[PDB]
Design a binder for this molecule. Structure first.
Ligand code: 2GP
Length: 104
């Protein structure tokens, strides 16, 4: 099947894990990439049902499979906390404005 379905993109367990690990590491080293400085704090304005503690950080997960390196981030994001716990996988696809919806 598809573990995480973002809009029309499909990500597996290891895809999310690989992306999350990349973002978490940059977070640890205080590093960011891209015009929007990823990874950066995700305040959860959407009020998603996160079962892990804040603070949260969003990081792009690419449909292609490459680890984000500051280029075009696309619409999908993995969200993790300081414990490197996956808070969830969200996307701009299906949402209005600069809002998000959870990939299912
Ligand atoms: N939609 C949304 N934007 C957030 C959230 N937390 C931080 N932001 C940031 O707040 C601003 C307005 O939405 C943007 O800079 C956005 O960054 P991103 O565009 O990288 O998501 C959140 O929970 N939801």
């Amino acid at each position: 099947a598809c573990d995480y379905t973002c809009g029309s993109n499909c990500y597996s367990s290891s895809d999310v894990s690989t992306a999350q690990a990349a973002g978490y590491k940059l977070h640890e080293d205080g590093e960011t990439v891209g015009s929007n400085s990823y990874p950066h704090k995700y305040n959860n304005y959407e009020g998603f049902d996160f079962s892990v503690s804040s603070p949260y950080y969003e990081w792009p997960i690419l449909s292609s499979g490459d680890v984000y390196s500051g280029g075009s981030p696309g619409a999908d994001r993995v969200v993790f906390n300081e414990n490197n716990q996956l808070a969830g996988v969200i996307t701009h696809t299906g949402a209005s404005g600069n809002n998000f919806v959870e990939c299912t």
